[PDB]
Amino acid sequence: LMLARQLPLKSVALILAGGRGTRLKDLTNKRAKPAVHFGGKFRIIDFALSNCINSGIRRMGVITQYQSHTLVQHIQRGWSFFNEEMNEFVDLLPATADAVTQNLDIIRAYKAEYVVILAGDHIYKQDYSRMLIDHVEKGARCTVACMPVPIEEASAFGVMAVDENDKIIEFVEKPANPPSMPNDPSKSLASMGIYVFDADYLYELLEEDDRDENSSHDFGKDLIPKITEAGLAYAHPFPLSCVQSDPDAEPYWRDVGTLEAYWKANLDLASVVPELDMYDRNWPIRTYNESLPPAKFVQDRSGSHGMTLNSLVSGGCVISGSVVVQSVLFSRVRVNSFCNIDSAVLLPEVWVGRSCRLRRCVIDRACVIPEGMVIGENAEEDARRFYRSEEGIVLVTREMLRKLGHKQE
Amino acid sequence: LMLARQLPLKSVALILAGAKPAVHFGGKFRIIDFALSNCINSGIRRMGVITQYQSHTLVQHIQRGWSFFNEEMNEFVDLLPAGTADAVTQNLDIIRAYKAEYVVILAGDHIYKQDYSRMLIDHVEKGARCTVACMPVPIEEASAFGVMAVDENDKIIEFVEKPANPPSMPNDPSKSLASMGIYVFDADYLYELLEEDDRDSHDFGKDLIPKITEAGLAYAHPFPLSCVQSDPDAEPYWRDVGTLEAYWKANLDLASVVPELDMYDRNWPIRTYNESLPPAKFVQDRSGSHGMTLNSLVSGGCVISGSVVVQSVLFSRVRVNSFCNIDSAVLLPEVWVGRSCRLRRCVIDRACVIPEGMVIGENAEEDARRFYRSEEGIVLVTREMLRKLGHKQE
Amino acid sequence: LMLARQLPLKSVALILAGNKRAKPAVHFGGKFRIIDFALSNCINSGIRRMGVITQYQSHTLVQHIQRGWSFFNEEMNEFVDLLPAQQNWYRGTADAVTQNLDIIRAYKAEYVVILAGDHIYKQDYSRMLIDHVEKGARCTVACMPVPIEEASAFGVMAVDENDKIIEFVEKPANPPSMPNDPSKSLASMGIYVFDADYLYELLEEDDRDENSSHDFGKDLIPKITEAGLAYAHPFPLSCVQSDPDAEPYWRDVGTLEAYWKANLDLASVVPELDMYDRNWPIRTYNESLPPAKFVQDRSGSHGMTLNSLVSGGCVISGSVVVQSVLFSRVRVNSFCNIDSAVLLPEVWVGRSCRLRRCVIDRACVIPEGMVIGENAEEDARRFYRSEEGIVLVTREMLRKLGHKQE
Amino acid sequence: LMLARQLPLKSVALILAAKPAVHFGGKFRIIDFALSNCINSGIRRMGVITQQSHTLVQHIQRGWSFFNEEMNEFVDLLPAGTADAVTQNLDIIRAYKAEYVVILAGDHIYKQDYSRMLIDHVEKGARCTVACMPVPIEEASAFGVMAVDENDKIIEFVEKPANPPSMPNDPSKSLASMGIYVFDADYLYELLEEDDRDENSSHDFGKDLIPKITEAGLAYAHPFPLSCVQSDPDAEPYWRDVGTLEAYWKANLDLASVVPELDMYDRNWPIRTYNESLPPAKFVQDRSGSHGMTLNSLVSGGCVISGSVVVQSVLFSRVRVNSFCNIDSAVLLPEVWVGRSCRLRRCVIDRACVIPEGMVIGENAEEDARRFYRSEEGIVLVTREMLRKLGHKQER
Structure with a gap:
């Protein structure tokens, strides 16, 4: 037949x-x-x-x-x-x-x-x-x-x-x-x-x-x-x-x-x-096709180039030099000068201040990382400030930064 | 009023x-x-x-x-x-x-x-x-x-x-x-x-x-x-x-x-066809070394194996293989750059397949013979030009 | 400026x-x-x-x-x-x-x-x-x-x-x-x-x-x-x-x-x-509907229409439609007299019905020979009837009266 | 397989x-x-x-x-x-x-x-x-x-x-x-x-x-x-x-x-087309205040019919039919305007035609053949140029 x-x-x-089952939040703090x-x-x-x-x-x-x-x-x-x-x-x-x-x-x-x-x-x-x-x-x-x-x-x-x-x-x-x-x-x-x-x-x-009743x-x-x-x-x-x-x-x-x-x-x-x-063109995945500018890579304040190893940079991103390795940058992520982004997942609209070093972490949507913040290097300190998984993965939701006195607007 | x-x-x-x-x-x-x-x-x-x-x-x-x-x-x-x-x-x-x-x-x-x-x-x-x-x-x-x-x-x-x-x-x-x-x-x-x-x-x-x-x-x-x-x-x-x-x-x-x-500018946006593309993908070269990017644009669907991209604009789905040096170049969609290419001050047209080790933008006379070279020194590379040199477009 | x-x-x-909508x-x-x-x-x-x-x-x-x-x-x-x-006297x-x-x-x-x-x-x-x-x-x-x-x-x-x-x-x-x-x-x-x-x-x-x-x-x-x-x-x-x-x-x-x-x-x-008004148009869901279909009744007779609207997908076998509005996909069977009525989508009017000064809710199934709008007392019992004389007919009302809605 | x-x-x-x-x-x-x-x-x-x-x-x-x-x-x-x-x-x-x-x-x-x-x-x-x-x-x-x-x-x-x-x-x-x-x-x-x-085929x-x-x-x-x-x-x-x-x-x-x-x-094999936003088919009274009659006919959205008699006909979108009309076995394409007191039989009115007041089609075989194209089997076609040669203003 x-x-x-x-x-x-x-x-x-x-x-x-x-039925939310994720720690991640999406701009209203309860995704x-x-x-x-x-x-x-x-x-x-x-x-x-x-x-x-x-x-x-x-x-x-x-x-x-x-x-x-x-x-x-x-x-x-x-x-x-x-x-x-x-x-x-x-x-x-x-x-x-x-x-x-x-x-x-x-x-x-x-x-x-x-x-x-x-x-x-x-x-x-x-x-x-x-x-x-x-x-x-x-x-x-x-x-x-x-x-x-x-x-x-x-x-x-x-x-x-x-x-x-x-x-x-x-x-x-x-x-x-x-x-x-x-x-x-x-x-x-x-x-x-x-x-x-x-x-x-x-x-x-x-x-x-x-x-x-009991079912x-x-x-x-x-x-x-x-x-x-x-x-x-x-x-x-x-x-x-x-x-x-x-x-x-x-x-x-x-x-x-x-x-x-x-x-x-x-x-x-x-x-x-x-x-x-x-x-795979034989089994494609449909989603909202946001209109985004091409990923823009620019020089840092020192005029140096950026380096990239096995990473994804979605539309709207802007990266000033820096080194991005084993990372995924969603749409509109801004990475300022002298950053070392490392084995990290940065959700859309993340703003990373200058001189940051992110490592084995997941920055939540629209987080504003202040200038010179380090994550993923000191286990105890990272666990103190944010959430740290049993295996060593760090989660940084914008509320966590708020608790530390960093304005996220 | x-x-x-x-x-x-x-x-x-x-x-x-x-x-x-x-x-x-x-x-x-x-x-x-x-x-x-x-x-x-x-x-x-x-x-x-x-x-x-x-x-x-x-x-x-x-x-x-x-x-x-x-x-x-x-x-x-x-x-x-x-x-x-x-x-x-x-x-x-x-x-x-x-x-x-x-x-x-x-x-x-x-x-x-x-x-x-x-x-x-x-x-x-x-x-x-x-x-x-x-x-x-x-x-x-x-x-x-x-x-x-x-x-x-x-x-x-x-x-x-x-x-x-x-x-x-x-x-x-x-x-x-x-x-x-x-x-x-x-x-x-x-x-x-x-x-x-x-x-x-x-x-x-x-x-x-x-x-x-x-x-x-x-x-x-x-x-x-x-x-x-x-x-x-x-x-x-x-x-x-x-x-x-x-x-x-x-x-x-x-x-x-x-x-x-x-x-x-979000106050005067420009509407166009919103292509569904995967994020620009940067990977390691055959040597396992990182890539370098300076004042360049990399559109969706691109895949870049290490290499150096400077003062360039890469349209959608541009493929750049290992050990490339691209400088002040404009690569239109679906361009395929073979390994070990060096492009300078040029414009690569849609879907060009650049073979392995081709150099462009350094020898003015040679470039002018193979392709079109403007009086100011800019080179244009089409599919037809490449076929004339015996490079299959497929 | x-x-x-x-x-x-x-x-x-x-x-x-x-209630629902x-x-x-x-x-x-x-x-x-x-x-x-x-x-x-x-x-x-x-x-x-x-x-x-x-x-x-x-x-x-x-x-x-x-x-x-x-x-x-x-x-x-x-x-x-x-x-x-997420939901006092005033809303x-x-x-x-x-x-x-x-x-x-x-x-x-x-x-x-x-x-x-x-x-x-x-x-x-x-x-x-x-x-x-x-x-x-x-x-x-x-x-x-x-x-x-x-x-x-x-x-x-x-x-x-x-x-x-x-x-x-x-x-x-x-x-x-x-x-x-x-x-x-x-x-x-x-x-x-x-x-x-x-x-x-x-x-x-x-x-x-709290007072506000x-x-x-x-x-x-x-x-x-x-x-x-x-x-x-x-x-x-x-x-x-x-x-x-x-x-x-x-x-x-x-x-x-x-x-x-x-x-x-x-x-x-x-x-x-x-x-x-083409200068101030009204946007809505543009449903794909077949043209309004007017056909003969079982007797082969024509239908009469006066000051009425017939939306897409409707099918009218003869009958008389006056001062009425028929929404999409409304079926009106033979020998019907519809007068000053509003029929919401997918209403099915059986043969030999007479509707007057009423409102039929979505997908109502009117049996054969039902009369509405003429006997005030009886209409008030059967359905809802406003003080001014307007009748409303829902699917549930027709259910309680023993008329299958399916 | x-x-x-x-x-x-x-x-x-x-x-x-x-x-x-x-x-x-x-x-x-x-x-x-x-x-x-x-x-x-x-x-x-x-x-x-x-x-x-x-x-x-x-x-x-x-x-x-x-x-x-x-x-x-x-x-x-x-x-x-x-x-x-x-x-x-x-x-x-x-x-x-x-x-x-x-x-x-x-x-x-x-x-x-x-x-x-x-x-x-x-x-x-x-x-x-x-x-x-x-x-x-x-x-x-x-x-x-x-x-x-x-x-x-x-x-x-x-x-x-x-x-x-x-x-x-x-x-x-x-x-x-x-x-x-x-x-x-x-x-x-x-x-x-x-x-x-x-091959030079x-x-x-x-x-x-x-x-x-x-x-x-x-x-x-x-x-x-x-x-x-x-x-x-x-x-x-x-x-x-x-x-x-x-x-x-x-x-x-x-x-x-x-x-x-x-x-x-057929909901199991539907036909897709351009779904234009149209108002419901509007039937109104004629100049005499009398009702209209319809027999085995289709009336698309945007049409407006003042009384009249429509028989075995198909009216595409936005057809205007004025008072005292008798349309029979006719196909009126979109935006047709039918003047008062017309009688159309066995014909096809093309897009945006403006039928003047009191025009008759389908009855006097010779007359209709003179006015515009008439098939050997007896069907008449009315195009805007046809009316312009007959001197009736369009494009209104």
Whole structure:
């Protein structure tokens, strides 16, 4: 049959945004994880949405669960180009499962055959059409995408065990002592929060869930386990649909929970061969295309040139000489003279005063680094002034600088 | 008063093109962007781009970056196909439907910032049927321009188009009073003039402007009255970018520490096609050494492996491989610079593939043989030139 | 000094938006939603920076702004921000602005234009900005004479020879009359122009005071007046209208009768409100709809139409449509008599229906042979019937009567 | 293979060719169908070869310039027999880097799922696939006629033969080419390069390239029913060329009938066009205060009708109809102004016509034929020049 082209059209994807899980702030001091700046020009949610477009699912519902203005604004500036008459749109649904139930009437209006539940706070490339094919072929009422993960990390994920037909036999949510994969147990088998539902089953099921007082109203914590025990939950190996230029590589998926994970994932793009390919013309990522002037590199006050090693400089940046290494500079970052920026991620509109030395850190949006501030060299002092991760990564939010008496306007 | 904002709404701007208007400039722009942008910032949201010839790149640029208007709100960018006035006469039927009280004739092949609303005020206040924007230019060059002589009330006493003996200004002999090819017309008067003129040159300057002057209905508009500039204590910025040297000079100006042209002005922004590009990527060379950048621009999508980039402007997606020394150069989009190249005082055209170890800008004679070399010493490198030398473009 | 061109660009407009669909998001005139007017005015006045403050985050309002008012290129200093508000006797009008005060400060505007997005009118805010500056006021309030009987609902003001506000009172029970004509009062239109800095300071001061109700009219305007910094702006100075002689058009549309009246107004031969004015157009969501399709009824008979509007996607089998407005995708089956009615989108009228002086809500399914508008007592039982005689029919009402809505 | 969806994404559509920019069905322009088909088939990369024709460029600009180029979707305006036009721009087309090329004619009205034709193309392993439809033998001479074997491989092709070969399945019909081709991109490029580079052919697919492919045995046929989209499966495939005036009039009026052959309400295969902001269709009283009558007719946005009688008619956007008018089996294109007391029958009024007061059309056959063009079958066409020679002022 010609089902592959048909299934996306019969499907609707819902992206559960909101639920901030990041220390980073975006100019009002309380951002949501889905709207976190990434890779110089992107926000995390862009990935999920982008996948939908490239997968053939042009009907999306972004659920923003705390009236966030930066996420709504991003959807409005970068994802409001659709012609509703062509069966394509990005609806902004107001306020994990509870939010979906709250908008259940509006969703039924979509009149969708299959529903794609996604988490808009992960960075990955996946062809959802393949997962829909697997859904129909395997014929479950619910299909869940899964992948092997290190045992140490498995506590944050939902762990599952399947049979020969990839039918979900056992599921447990963020267990403290996660089961290892039965065979080749170098790591437990974690779920990716990516679901495909037959629309009718999901509607009925959410109706059932809202009336239970004791249910936690979460897919992983309450809903999915109930789905699993009835034997209607099948598994989808992520490699079956994961999109990647180099076939001989591990599937790329980052939940970007910790500061260290964020710092690592961003700096990856500055390396010679990044694990994540952001140049792939066959699976592009859509975002708000801000009009920015070219990156401007100028001489410092001493008239010296600037040096750069394995770094990214987004539009609107202005760099006076200085040395920038293993760093990612988002849009409109100003770096004044005699700076040493080092293994750092500077979010948009950061202003770095002269004679600064930044190292293994993440400067938050619009921070104003005063003149001659040093970061990343004295562990105790840095931990005192700002936040320092267990591995040694520093986070500098503009509020932290305010507490130290440095005006950020 | 209410006149100031309402005059723009009753006006329509026509941008005559040719392709020069579709020339890359400043890393992310095309020249026409300025003219159009001025209109937007001046309150004129109804534009008519007359393409001398249907240029695929110009039509495409207008389609990708300037086709965002809601026609029901009295805003549009019409693509009108086509002497200079003859092109307007051809689309005269379409233009009448605009139902504009005033028509703004612009040249889409110049780089400048001008508030056309001020020129409209000056036009109405003076009550002329036609107003011409004028700026002093060196007398030596005035032969290329249309020159004018005015009275105390900025009324044009005399006009001559491209005169062999350009008149000097009575009170500033070093230069003359030049017309900028920027006009404001009473729409109905323009219609009458075009109808009468077709039944006859077919150029505004050579034919129409002298006729209007003879009727005493042609007034002048000093450019400083409306020119937009960050530093008031400076000469008005207007570059025709005709010659290679002018193009190279204007582009590299944007790379200097203090450019004469402010491309960071949020009060008079320039609209263009907002390309979706990855950040400019700097990487290590084959030796693992760092790269050096001095007073240069690096647009999105570029990938630069170490090397030294000085006094240069790199447009989008320019690839610069290891061990390169680029100095006072302008690299247009999609240029591919092979390893170990040394480019100096040159302009590399779109998508050139520079092979490995080519040197340019050091041996004048050799450069002149391979490519085009201006009298002042600037080199231009096209895809065709490179094919003549046997270097595959693919 | 070429002020008119500059002031809008230095200004930002704030549109305050207070069962399911919110008042600013009420369908109107076949294709529009009320808020469209306010926004449109801003656009036509030169103010391309707007902030829609939604007290109740209506999915239909956000969705409408998303489909029809998210076409701006932010790099040119133009946008429509969706500002949420998180919710005493008087609704806290100012509180909603106070909540988003940080974002608004980020605009860095010299002047702020406060608007009510639940009124239908055409006004050139640039004229009010010029007058604002000329008077040198810190606050200018748009004012219009209104019938005194109704004036109790409005905020009433008394001005001097220089249009400076001398006295202000919100919703007086015993409304003061105007000196010239005491059958009218001088009412505030809930349209303000503020010096940005002054507004910021005033909101900061107001949020601290517990006594204040955080409403523009009851507390803020009196405070400004007592300082002698509140000037008035005659609406005719800026009201935009095709016919210079007619009276300024401004409709509150709170009452059901007001909605029915305003909608039906567009169906008359000469409506008071000109929706064909190419010089002051109204922007809205341009839905792709097929042309209005008129077909024969089951008997093969023609349809009759008198002073009515038929929006795109409608399908009418014969029937008689009089003094009515049919929104998009309305199906009217055979042998129907529609009279002085307003049918919101996707209404389905079964065969042999007779509707009169009524309002059918979105997507209602009228069964076959239902009569409305003729038996006052029965209509009042079945649905909602206003004191003046107008009927409203919602999907739920038809549900309770045993008629499937699906 | 596993997933068919990828074939469209690997393809680019080229729409050749004033005809494509003709108003149809009240709101659409003909080209809208082709383009729309591409969209609904998964082909979001189109190249419209124009000329320039201002109306076509403008339509593409207002209604088909909403694409995000970074997502591999666009409708670029390519300027320029038929194959020569593609050859002119094949530098740009090669830049597309498409695996398959879909050549379409933008002057036909039809609904077709090109993805199914791509499947058939690959499955048959053809270098070129030509969409084929039975046509009446009398009419088949204007078309390119072909003869195939059991495997739908094209055995014989002839362009516009005067003596069309008959077909076995329906002697009353022959096998006609629909001017819809699917090519392996590289192969197509090779054929164009060699033809412009060497052969002195007419540079037409049917006259030159299709025959060349057939003699090579690399040209297969694709039955239109395999991909034609229609709500009623038990119905005949819809495909109208609209060259003749009568065809235009008929196709337009079909949409006003109770059950149109062409479904313009299909939410599963919608047609995109320029969505102009128009006020609702306004019906008002005539000068006598009397009602208006309507029978099986369409009234687009912006129209204003004062009473009058409108029967079996299509009124495009912003048509003004004054009092005491009787319009019957007529198609009035946008912005027409009909004076008081007119009676129009079986005609097509062109854009922005101003019909003076009391003019009658469609009744006195001779009189109408005298005034302006009248087809042999009895349809009248009214153009603004026609009225100017009759002395009625336009441009008001």
